[PDB]
Amino acid sequence: AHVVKIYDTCIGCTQCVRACPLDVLEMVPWDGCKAAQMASSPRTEDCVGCKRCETACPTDFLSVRVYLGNESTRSLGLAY
Amino acid sequence: GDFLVHHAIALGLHTTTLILVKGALDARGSKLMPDKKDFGYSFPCDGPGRGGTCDISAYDAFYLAVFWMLNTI
Amino acid sequence: MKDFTTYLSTAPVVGLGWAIFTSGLLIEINRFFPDPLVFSF
Amino acid sequence: MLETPVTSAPIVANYLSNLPAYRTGVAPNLRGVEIGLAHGFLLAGPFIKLGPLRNVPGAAEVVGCMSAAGLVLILALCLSLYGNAAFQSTQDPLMSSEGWAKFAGGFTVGGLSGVAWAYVLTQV
Amino acid sequence: DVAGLTPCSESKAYNKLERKELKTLEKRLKKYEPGSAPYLALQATKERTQNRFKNYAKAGLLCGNDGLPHLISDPGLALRFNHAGEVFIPTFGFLYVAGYIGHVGRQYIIKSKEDAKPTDKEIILDVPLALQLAFQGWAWPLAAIQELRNGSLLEKDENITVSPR
Amino acid sequence: FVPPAWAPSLFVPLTGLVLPAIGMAWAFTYIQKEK
Amino acid sequence: KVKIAVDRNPVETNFEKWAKPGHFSRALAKGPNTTTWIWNLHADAHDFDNHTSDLEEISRKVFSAHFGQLGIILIWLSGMYFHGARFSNYEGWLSDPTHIKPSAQVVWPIVGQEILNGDVGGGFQGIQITSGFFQLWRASGITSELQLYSTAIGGLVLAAACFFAGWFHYHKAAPKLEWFQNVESMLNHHLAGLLGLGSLAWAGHQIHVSLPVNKLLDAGVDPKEIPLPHEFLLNQSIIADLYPSFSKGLAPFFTLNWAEYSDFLTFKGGLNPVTGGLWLSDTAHHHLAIAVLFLVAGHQYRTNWGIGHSIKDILESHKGPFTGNGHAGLYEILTTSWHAQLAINLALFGSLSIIVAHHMYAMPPYPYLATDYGTQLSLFTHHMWIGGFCVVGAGAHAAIFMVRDYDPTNNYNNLLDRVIRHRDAIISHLNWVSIFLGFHSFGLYIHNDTMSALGRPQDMFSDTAIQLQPVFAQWIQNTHFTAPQLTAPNALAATSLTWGGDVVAVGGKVAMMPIALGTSDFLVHHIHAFTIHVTVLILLKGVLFARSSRLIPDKANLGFRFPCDGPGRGGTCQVSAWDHVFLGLFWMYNSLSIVIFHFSWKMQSDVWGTVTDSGVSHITGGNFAQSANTINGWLRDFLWAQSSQVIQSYGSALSAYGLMFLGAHFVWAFSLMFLFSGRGYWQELIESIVWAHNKLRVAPSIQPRALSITQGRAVGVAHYLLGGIATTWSFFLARIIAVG
Amino acid sequence: PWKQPELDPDTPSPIFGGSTGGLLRKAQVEEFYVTTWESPKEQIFEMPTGGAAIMRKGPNLLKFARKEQCLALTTQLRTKFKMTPCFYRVYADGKVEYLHPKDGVYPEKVNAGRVGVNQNMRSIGENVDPIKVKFTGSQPFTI
Ligand code: CLA
Ligand code: CLA
Ligand code: CLA
Ligand code: CLA
Ligand SMILES: CC1=C(/C=C/C(C)=C/C=C/C(C)=C\C=C\C=C(C)\C=C\C=C(C)\C=C\C2=C(C)CCCC2(C)C)C(C)(C)CCC1
Ligand SMILES: CC1=C(C/C=C(\C)CCC[C@H](C)CCC[C@H](C)CCCC(C)C)C(=O)c2ccccc2C1=O
Ligand code: SF4
């Protein structure tokens, strides 16, 4: 499926997870940010690449990136 | 009239050149997409974020320059 | 007055004023100098 | 899921039950023969009417019959292609690969038989 | 007599075009009584056409094989054949006016940035300030080349927003 | 040397009907070829 | 129960909010920082549902906006009447309407545009107008320019009154929500007062003013010697001489002997041979009957006096077994949602505009209207396009209601819920119908073109080879030709000349004549049905899938107007209902363009022309029976055979039509860069221009940004529609003025 | 959470008629998703696959063909009534997979029990150029 990569510039604001319509991201404990939270993608096989997480990222550039490629039944959003 | 149509030809060539060199120079990165090299040459968009990012690849610049080249020829 | 003046100070209103001014200037120039093409004093 | 009076009508149910495709009471060869007969008989219709030789009497029916036979053969080829390229991997024998091949053979046999029957009916 | 072309006064197709225009104006005029407003309107149109055709002649304008006047754009060639007033003087005048516009816009951009919310001044124009900068732009090339001399016209490449490579 | 007069009556239907039909048949079997 | 509920002075008339451009929404209240704010200023200006969540303020804003639009309309009408009063040859046109072209716009001689003031006749110079205002004023009994001046001054006064009324009813005395929700009182007052009372007043004007002036004009007397309408109003001798039943003096009306009014309230259905228009007595009895029917219908709903009908009770009572809760929650929907009422009003208004265009080309209800081919063509095309725009806005605002004002609590098993519950079957069946129609019409056209290019005229679907005649339309035409014979024996002749009969001509030009229907007519009618079906499919798919879909299950949370949902699931570009309306606008444009092309070609070939002693010689010689069956026939015998007047209009008064034609081609071509492409390319180009202006230190404080994807689509569709509309307008007007 | 709940097919479905955008043949060929919640009272909600339904006072079970529909229903129930539902995925062979509350605390929280995966520890824009990773099968963002 698609590739979801999260960098260290994330501030743990949990906006990307709330904007996710397929429950791909998660919040794990961290020490590199003030909020002590870091975004993770343990369910990247269910991500369709809608880039809704990138819209909700408040940091400049993007702390979360979605790269398309190798579309599957789950990645193409097919009910059939 | 030949003078006017020659200047029209010059306009077409310069505009197609502008589109193609903007696609080539901003191919690996831009301000809307600094990481345009990681997304390959032909990718659709980055979504509706940052105001909208459709037709941002160099392939889309080439595909608009095809229209401009067709008009010039 | 000053609220109406700031409304008149908005960009579309002053653009409209420039539009009427320039159009009237060019129209009166064309009317009192009928169809010139080459500058010949 | 959304049931309708026309889909769940008992008359519609028994009309679709005894159809050769949904009978599930016979070999695929007989179903293919019936399908080919019916569809060739109806497909010969527009060919004996509006073909390029429709103004010429006699030859119009023959030309339409060979065109219907060619269309039947093309449909049989596409049926065989679908059977070979659809059921190539793992209770109805029609959904099987060789079952669909026998269905296609029955379909082309019925198609040529229906074309011949339409030719006989148009001649008489 | 440059580019194998004849002057408009000496040309025959120019006079033929003028005669055809006068003929069709007279044909339109003959359908109205002399004591009617369309008659005076068409007479004024004919007078304007005659004045324009007289002014296009005896002014250096030349036409080739169709009676439609032609313009010479190369300086020097236009200078030695009195064709500078065709495009050479108007292009300098347009450059003067365009520099006026650019200098006025630059002055308004710079002078409305050292204040709180410059976008508010951009969207709601300071009309007395705009008029003051409008009447102060008559010496645009002097101020432009002086800003070039002191280096305030151009920004250095360190304070300029730049796209990643 | 010179082809016979019936060559347009044979090669044109062959490359207009038969050859594209067998090409589409081969391509359809190649698209849906599974392991 | 029904009573006036008005709040006194809720909004103070202050200019403090005129200084701040963005004030209606909190998003724009923070001030501008990018240029996309400015477009957002001009996009959410009338989005009153987004500014406030209170329905009362939205209703007050709607009332004020309607008053403003009525004031604008009255200003435009007063300006039209003023232009007819001063810069017009209406008095000259009244003397000879069959030789002087109607002109009401005069230009200023400035840069050679005085050549646009063509020789329209009557000692006047101007632009030949195609609005038909001259025929409307002749139908209204207007004779002198003083009456037009008085009408213009009254229109300006009423426009100022309506503008002050909007200011008063918003700022001073704002009606409450309960005042707007009295739908029964609104319907009763509109049926009885807005429509019926106006119909009765216009009927009385036609009886007392328009009929005698029109009768004297048809008699051939001097319009200057025609007595003034007040002479007919006060003194009864002239109205008794013109109509003996006026000598009774309202006796037959109050004694129920209405047959005595048959001299000036006639039923002679057809065209007046003197002027080629509808009989004014027929229009008088028509508007009188319409007024009576609407005053009857306006006493239907119960408001404050016990008797009447309840809309909620009627809607809840009409429930069947196959529909569950039949029309249950619709009363609460239409009394709380402005957008549902907007969709209903726009759909019915557009359909009625299409009806107006069809029944106005069919029956010209104006003296000397059918002789003016340009006026009829322009009016038909204009009403056609306004109807199409209204019916596509109906789908747009229905989708807006679906996104915003739909509540699942009030819609459990009602009709809207079941429509949403089988929307997939609806869309699939409509898609199949559209595909089948497009095949069996456009493929028929391609078949005709191929068999024409293959040298097989006997293989074509033409009027000579394969007779696919419209037997139903021909049977209906024959039945309506016999409508006065057996089923409506009180009518003197047929209700229109399109069904059949003879040829009515005015001044040597044919006003109306029977229209023959062949295979080409069947082909173009089925093509029109196919295009309408496709547009209906697009707009219905936009409306029904506005909330959710299999592709996107949470489309309602994204709003009505969003560009996309990213490239996920393969790509979700143009998935919103707004994008569906944007796509359907082009299909509406294509449908109506084909419709008006069919109208223009059919009426130029089989209706319009001149009448000589040998017969009726049409403009194009009746090529529609042999050329309309192929696409190349429309390409050559309709688009290339015509449009020669547009390209040869240079040097004449019609050259502005050619210039407008070129500009329309330009705008149509310029729209394609917004229709194609995207946003990132222009954003990076704007970034490069930003660098260029930053080098010169002329970078604006407001950051320039590219247009939004929705904004870019809107700009593209707007410029595309404007270019196509103005192209057809210029081509139609130039062709119909030069040769007509 | 502490113990992963097991789905019950015998739980009553919410009161609804017939759906057209419901489960297709993929439900009997591939996996399909099933959402469970616990309604304290009967109320009307809007399904993402059609119109409106009424949930029963008790357990409620719904079936969908897409995970996006399940999460849309979950977030609608959480925003409108604070329901906290949970959906499983059932394959063709009957394998049941727990999908939304992986730790039972929802992904908006942390719970100090999830290991962050697919996290690049370098800043964005510090990735190598595609010329550096050529003919290797490794993307610049995958390192
Ligand atoms: C029989 C009485 C009557 C009449 C004639 C009208 C007439 C009208 N109403 Mg109204 N309405 C009425 C009663 C009436 N209303 C009642 C009782 C209610 C409350 C239930 C409403 C609630 C209502 C709403 C909510 C809206 C209208 C609107 C309109 C306009 C529709 C647009 C149109 O057709 O333009 C026809 C235009 C003309 C004929 C031009 C002349 C218009 C004149 C000035 C109006 C004169 C009639 C007026 C009602 C007399 C009383 C006002 C008096 C105190 C001065 C029209 C002017 C719409 C609107 O706001 O438009 C501004 C609108 O949205 N009506
Ligand atoms: C709205 C439409 C309309 C209008 C305005 C009129 C108006 C008129 N018609 Mg027409 N008519 C109509 C429809 C209409 N009719 C229709 C539908 C038909 C059916 C075919 C006819 C058939 C018809 C015939 C056959 C005749 C008329 C005639 C008349 C006139 C007689 C009026 C009369 O006695 O009525 C009754 C009028 C009143 C009772 C007056 C109203 C009460 C007043 C206004 C009270 C004022 C009080 C006020 C406070 C005090 C003054 C204020 C001041 C001090 C400042 C009048 C000009 C007759 C005519 O022209 O001869 C004179 C005639 O022969 N009409
Ligand atoms: C009965 C009339 C009516 C009414 C009262 C409304 C009211 C509304 N509509 Mg609707 N609409 C209508 C008809 C109507 N519409 C029709 C006929 C169409 C189809 C064309 C639409 C299509 C439509 C869409 C697609 C949308 C609306 C929206 C809206 C809302 C805000 C509109 C706004 O802010 O525009 C502000 C004004 C403008 C943006 C200016 C528009 C100018 C156009 C684009 C170009 C004009 C060209 C002109 C004719 C020629 C210019 C030539 C040039 C050289 C000068 C509001 C609820 C919007 C919304 O959010 O709904 C809630 C929305 O998205 N409507
Ligand atoms: C002339 C160009 C053209 C054509 C042919 C189509 C064709 C189609 N569009 Mg359309 N469309 C077009 C331009 C065109 N579009 C443009 C410019 C736009 C932008 C506004 C759209 C926007 C649009 C939308 C928004 C929708 C469509 C839909 C459709 C379908 C309707 C099917 C139908 O009724 O006709 C049947 C098809 C034809 C008549 C095609 C003509 C070709 C011949 C006659 C068919 C046979 C060819 C030949 C004999 C076989 C060759 C075999 C082999 C050699 C290849 C169809 C696929 C709708 C859809 O999906 O289906 C309902 C739909 O919703 N289109
Ligand atoms: C004589 C002549 C001619 C020629 C010319 C030429 C040849 C030119 C060249 C030129 C060039 C070769 C140029 C260059 C340049 C460069 C640069 C680098 C520039 C810059 C600029 C700037 C920077 C500007 C600025 C400004 C603005 C824009 C605004 C404000 C003001 C100012 C001015 C400051 C012709 C024939 C055509 C025509 C006639 C005349
Ligand atoms: C060209 C283009 C742009 C760029 C267009 C922009 C930035 C809009 C520019 C509008 C200008 C500023 C309007 C005013 C133009 C003149 C300066 C005003 C008239 C001047 C005369 C009176 C002298 C997009 O942003 C875009 C977005 C989405 C899809 C397609 C496109 C698209 O095609
Ligand atoms: S509309 Fe543009 S940004 Fe949005 S999904 Fe399509 S191409 Fe991408």
Numbering used by the authors:
A (entry chain C): 2 to 81
B (entry chain B): 516 to 588
C (entry chain J): 1 to 41
D (entry chain L): 56 to 145, 160 to 193
E (entry chain F): 63 to 227
F (entry chain I): 15 to 49
G (entry chain A): 12 to 751
H (entry chain D): 51 to 193
Quote what the paper states about this structure:
Multisubunit Photosystem I (PSI) encompasses half of this Fe in its three Fe4S4 centers and is a target for degradation in insufficient Fe conditions, which reduces the capacity for CO2 fixation. TIDI1 (thylakoid iron deficiency induced) is an iron starvation induced chlorophyll-binding protein found in multiple green algae including Dunaliella spp. isolated from coastal Arctic waters and hypersaline ponds. PSI and PSII are each associated with LHC proteins for increased absorption cross-section, LHCA for PSI and LHCB (or LHCBM) for PSII. In this work, we report high-resolution cryoelectron microscopy (cryo-EM) structures of PSI-LHCI supercomplexes from Fe-starved compared to Fe-replete cells of both D. salina and D. tertiolecta.
Cryo-EM analysis of the PSI-LHCI supercomplexes from Fe-starved cells revealed major populations (~60% and 30% for D. salina and D. tertiolecta, respectively) distinct from the PSI-LHCI1 structures found in the Fe-replete cells. The resulting structures (hereafter named PSI–LHCI2) reached overall resolutions of 2.9 Å for D. salina and 2.7 Å for D. tertiolecta. The PSI–LHCI2 supercomplexes have an additional crescent-shaped LHCI tetramer with associated pigments that is evident in both Dunaliella spp. grown in Fe-starved conditions. The larger size of the DsPSI–LHCI2 supercomplex versus the DtPSI–LHCI2 supercomplex in the biochemical preparations can be explained, in part, by the presence of PSAG1, PSAH1, PSAO1, and the LHCA2-LHCA9 dimer in the DsPSI–LHCI2 supercomplex, but not the DtPSI–LHCI2 supercomplex. The biochemical preparations from Fe-starved D. tertiolecta cells contained a minor population of PSI-LHCI1 supercomplexes (~20%, resolved to 3.1 Å) containing PSAG1, LHCA2, and LHCA9, indicating that the absence of these subunits in the DtPSI–LHCI2 complex is not trivially explained by dissociation during sample preparation or vitrification. In terms of pigments and cofactors, we identified D. salina and D. tertiolecta PSI–LHCI2 supercomplexes to contain, respectively, 218 and 185 Chl a, 23 and 20 Chl b, 59 and 47 Car, 56 and 26 lipids, plus 3 Fe4S4, 1 Chl a’, and 2 phylloquinones in the reaction center. We could not confidently model Chl a302, Chl a305, and a carotenoid in PSAL1 of the DtPSI–LHCI2 supercomplex due to poor density in those regions. The outer LHCI tetramer of the Dunaliella spp. We modeled three Cars in TIDI1 in the same location as those in LHCA3 in both structures, and 13 Chls in D. salina and 12 in D. tertiolecta. Chl a611 in D. tertiolecta could not be modeled because of poor density in that region.
